[PDB]
């Protein structure tokens, strides 16, 4: 069996190996530096160390059976997978994370931190798989902050143990005093010192000796760089989180300034502003071809037959013409969203667009009086005679009826020229639509 | 020492700009140090003179035997002639700074002793450091690493300059006179650098300034620390926003089309196929649309880039000998690169055909309706019998499915005729080869 | 009666329900933690509790009779509105926020109507005319709520530990200097401000819980500071995004005029033009302003802008209705500098102009003499566009038209006109015979 | 009967001469109000400077009553309409409130209270107008943005220092540990010590540094917490403005680098050969170093068609009158020809047009040096140079000859040539409305074809 690296079994393994890598980082520096946490909970660290080494051995056995894409399809040959594993630097790291250096020294297990690539791979796969990318970027930044704060706390306690407990006023205080001699007090005061140094607050006692001066200078300079990267990586997240709202406000205020420059009357001004408020409230602010211009034609057609073929299968003119021509039709359909009361086309305008109603309710209004002859619901269709343009008709060069919206209709439009470029490759259905249009025009 | 230095494909010239950077960084980092701290003692003065003579020799060798040898472009034509390179550097604006920097005020050492304020014109050669910065940022495959190391280097340099200014103010008020000034008791550069870190970084926790000069010093230093820390945040934000720009644009379009497919209620298999397309396009191309990139370039580099990736694939097929080169170049500029997920149908048997398929990094199969006739590997052709015929013509002969993640290069029939209307004779001979081959 | 969710009465209700939600957040955590505010002003908190529960049950009724949109139409069937409300989670939040569980710690479910406060902030952000000033006020309100909740959390932790047993906690409240309620609240607010802005003049902690709370508080204050800086940075980048884009256009133009060695008279003419475009606020062009709108609102804005100017001239009044709609749809305006020649003599004119807010004059060949001065509303370009018999010239300019001031014209190009002139044949025979009458009017 | 011009330079010299005493009135009016040794010690200097600021305020009312405005394009130059357009503004109300004679009350109180002159700060619009006109007028806009930001936060830090010293004078000098110390002590009683320590306190509080003594009373706790929240807003605007200046100081460099990394990503994806990869990369570094990386149509897109035409004439016409072919032609054809040119830069070794191809473009050389070669390699027959011309014989399609439309020679570039691409269709649609010019171009094409 070959584990596919795009599957969900591989992400379950990425979680189950980013757990002991995180344990090995966090608790290996804390067990090395604090020397009572290693000595007290020794049975717990024996159990967790046996579990983390078993997961590291199974991680090597999984990476020797993880497929990789050669010419589009996955390699299933296990000897090819093993040779492609052996030529990697990750095989050197995943073998170096398993060398038997060995109870009293957890510094001999510091080569278990070398599998950082599994932890960074899990964080990358979670950020591309989850539904909350900015929430996971905040969680990733907070986890990197907590690893840096914890490693600096352990480094401050190791430096204070090397210099001497309580010989200076800067180091950790005297370990034989039972107030400072407990492990909870040791870890929480070292974490308090590391937080106050790395966040550049500095309420801690000032250094006395020269190596303490140098360590606090290097600590403040690590902390100002880390805390500049954190402030920048939160500000970039906030700016690229509300860039779409800022772009929509720029569009709205530019059209507002254009209307107050050109002296557009207040009714049309309120109509434009209520249309923009409707678009922002119902989240149709994007354009359809602008957000699907990057996908290929097959996936654009898959979305388009998934959402338009249900309303385009029950029509007068395209009933059983051609399946691929209905595919090209729903590719070349185009949306416009209308306002309530907005006339689509009066008596007198020359026709060039066929409209397909989708989530809307229209009305064939009269000229002078507002009388609804028949309300056209969603799935209905109009524009057909002025996009077919048949000879032998009345041929007044005008549309014969008024179309007015009752509510916010979402018409999916279709041009006659786009119909002809859809219809070039199949001329029998062309003649079919001409005769169907002739029938519907004679039986109007 | 070549006759003319290319200065774009010369790692030796990059090593020379590293040497003038090291001499210039010695001057900038050890001018105020010897000027303020007492590290120019009587048994180290020959060491300071030896490294300062090495610094002046590197400056003079730069002004004489390297910078009059640089290949430059005048009026389109590159220059190789060494007297013309020498005239160009002598009438340049680097030479004003270089001959204004190398002025030997070290002969003024007899008037006021060994004073490094005489050598404070050696810091005027900053253009060699900025030429080294631009050349290293252009040669490096990851510019954010060197932008971070340069922002760190400027931060450590302003803290070093502020440590030297604090030791000047400590020696001016008197060492150990007030509580604010330096007391004298440890390593002088380390405790003064610690004060400069805790002031510039706007931390505080130091002794409070006692007299009025110390209040003015601490006020101006805290103001400069506010703007140095703000410039540090702005530089790291610029590096972050210009480092995750393509990833953020890819993720923005990906969540935008996921928001569209959830707004129009599209199922989980079609949403999974769109997400699988997006993950494979990021893992292969590391970009959204290559046509959006290639539309920005000039037409000649567009031509050469299309030729070097597709002209071997066109010429390795036996069909394409007789076609002429202007039509071949225009159809290589009018190829479209689409991707097919595994199992997709590129040619359904019975549908209309309008496309010539040039396969590249993929493997499709023909199914004539599940038996594998010939597995089309990369470089092969299919879709050639519906491109040459007018109107409907011929339907597809077999169901063609993509086995792996095939990356077809497509040639639409409408773009083929839009090429063909500007080439009548090519249209004629192409129709003749069409009729002989079918 | 159905409250329309985009009306003004619904926003007046969003103000009147975002008042007691903000009250309940602020003063419910303060009355819970301080125990002298709750015990002294008990009549005032009973009155404001009665008013907050009255506005909460009225919000339950108003959300029950608010409307939603199916098929673009306003639903007014109250059973459908009540079913759509009961299916949502906000009815579960409102019925959880109105459990009378009655010590204001039992009234802490009243904070669950936070969505009305967030809705009021979003509706004010898309309704006001100072959106960056409202977003500064919104961010200041958010950080004052966090400073207040941290002050109440510090006083609760201090009351749980002991008043004045340590140096970290709030001092001994039996002393009348530290015992007053104003001193309690303003010292807890001063402490929470010094902690959450990462300043630290506070006394250092003593016990492990005080060390751990100050660690968690400093990390939360680092993330608060980072969010404040990221919000104000995105707001400053959006407050002058249009100004920075216009300055990038100006700087690219000046870089082009440095590189291609453009002479000083034309450089100062382009600099005067960009100074005018800055000082009269036309920094964005109408061709990119009118791209994001739908075609129906674009045509209606074209009507309401250009038709009242186009019907100011009496000889262009004899034109058909939908054809004038298409003509003002295709009218593209440009602005001319003073002294700029609109048309010299020896240039074949392919444009017709309608002067809108300008003042043009006809001059001789290289001689400033004023035969007539064209004004606002008048038009020209009509005798060299319809291919009439000229004085042995056909389509040629027989007059030099300069600009007296910064004039603005309506550029209607020849082929741009004719490609839609070909579709309306008899109306265009009427227009070409009217052009023959105009040529007869001026000069045979 | 003089009318000033608000787009001129006399108006900008007046904006400098009125942004001097507005800024003086802001700064030294809050300082003389709060510090009370400044008003009592330098009284003759403040009488002279307040006479100067009031004289310039009266002259700003007289200049704003003569600033012309635009209606129907022209500058309005009649004094009654200028006075009426001034009088129906709110700025006239702010100016006549800014010149209210409170010197009567200022002499009533004994020439010691400049608190009555705080309506002289009501001409802040002149200061904002001067900073706006300078930030569009100057050559260093980012340096002026930082100078403007430093002036704004120094106004706030100075005003907050004066507010802290007024609060300390109200509470009492040296009763608490937070207030300013006892001014009868001669060290803290000096005015330079007073102002510089108050400015030090205000910088430490308003930039959220805090080394100040902690407060004692509730009014001091409340003022310090209000100052700390104002200081975190001031630090947020400082970091936002300096981050915006850093992001806009190399925006063009970042977009060019994004184009470079996208080209490198495409060329490492499709795996081109390394000679073409370094050719395209050195081609893009040459386009950046010669400041021509952004295309002429995208630079000139914002401009009107008249200024686009004048810029295209003043660039391209000194090249297009060095061609020995187009010397007998007219102004409209030369305007349309220099409109329909598009420059494309070639690298060395690059082929312009190969022998035996269908001609679809005409080229005019400008800052370049080319060579027509044979089919073998680099054999220079003619070195086509600056201002010369080629491509004019295979786009006209003159049939009946031995060549037809076949470009007769292999043309390569020697240096980094910058040709002017003039297309075939872009010439035939630049000759469609001019038939006499069309047959003149055909007769010169017959002459140069009889040469060829
Ligand atoms: N005249 C007419 N058009 C109708 C009717 N019902 C739907 N329609 C569509 O309404 C139209 C309005 O524009 P068109 O003239 O373009 O074409 C007409 C038809 O497609 C009807 O009863 N009469
Ligand atoms: N049916 C078929 N087509 C093949 C085969 N080998 C190559 N091809 C090409 O594959 C094709 C797929 O599309 P077409 O029907 O257009 O035409 C077919 C042939 O040109 C084969 O064995 N069978
Ligand atoms: N020839 C001419 N045009 C005039 C005169 N007075 C106003 N005009 C307008 O000036 C014009 C300049 O451009 P047109 O040739 O387009 O058309 C001409 C007329 O519309 C006049 O006395 N002679
Ligand atoms: N054939 C030819 N073309 C030349 C010569 N000198 C300059 N040119 C130009 O080079 C050309 C290359 O392209 P064209 O065929 O389009 O037209 C040719 C001429 O305009 C020369 O000596 N012979
Ligand atoms: C710590 O305490 C022990 C006993 O209380 C003492 O002997 C030792 O000297 C102390 N350490 C220091 C550094 O003073
Ligand atoms: C607080 O003060 C009262 C009287 O002032 C005293 O009885 C009590 O012990 C004090 N408590 C503490 C913890 O100091
Ligand atoms: C200030 O100093 C004077 C004299 O030195 C003294 O009389 C006065 O009491 C002092 N004020 C305070 C508040 O201590």
Numbering used by the authors:
A (entry chain A): 159 to 260, 268 to 609
B (entry chain D): 206 to 573, 577 to 646
C (entry chain B): 159 to 260, 270 to 611
D (entry chain C): 158 to 609
Q: What does the publication say?
A:
Third, A3/B3 was reconstituted in nanodiscs with simply 1-palmitoyl-2-oleoyl-sn-glycero-3-phosphoglycerol (POPG) and 1-palmitoyl-2-oleoyl-sn-glycero-3-phosphocholine (POPC). Third, two intermediate states and a pre-open state were captured, with resolution of 3.33 Å, 3.33 Å, and 3.60 Å, respectively. These states are named ND_cGMP_intermediate, ND_cGMP_ intermediate, and ND_cGMP_pre-open (with 33.1%, 22.7%, and 1.7% particles, respectively). The conformational rearrangements in the CNBD and C-linker/gating ring of the intermediate and pre-open states are incremental and much subtler, as illustrated by pairwise comparisons. In ND_cGMP_ intermediate, both helices move upward but the C-terminal ends move more than the N-terminal ends do. In the closed state and intermediate state 1, R410 of A3 and R456 of B3 are the only amino acids on the gating ring (i.e., helices A’B’) that interact with the TMD, mainly D289 and E292 on S4. In ND_cGMP_closed and ND_cGMP_intermediate, R442 projects to the ion conduction pathway with up and down orientations, as in GDN. In ND_cGMP_intermediate, the R442-V396 interaction is maintained but the R442-S404 interaction is lost. Strikingly, even though all four subunits of all the channels are bound with cGMP, most of the channels are in closed (36.6%) or intermediate states (55.8%), and only a very small fraction of the channels is in the pre-open (1.7%) or open states (4.3%).
Cyclic nucleotide-gated (CNG) channels transduce chemical signals into electrical signals in sensory receptors and neurons. They are activated by cGMP or cAMP, which bind to the cyclic nucleotide-binding domain (CNBD) to open a gate located 50-60 Å away in the central cavity. Here, we report structures of the cGMP-activated human cone photoreceptor CNGA3/CNGB3 channel in closed, intermediate, pre-open and open states in detergent or lipid nanodisc, all with fully bound cGMP.
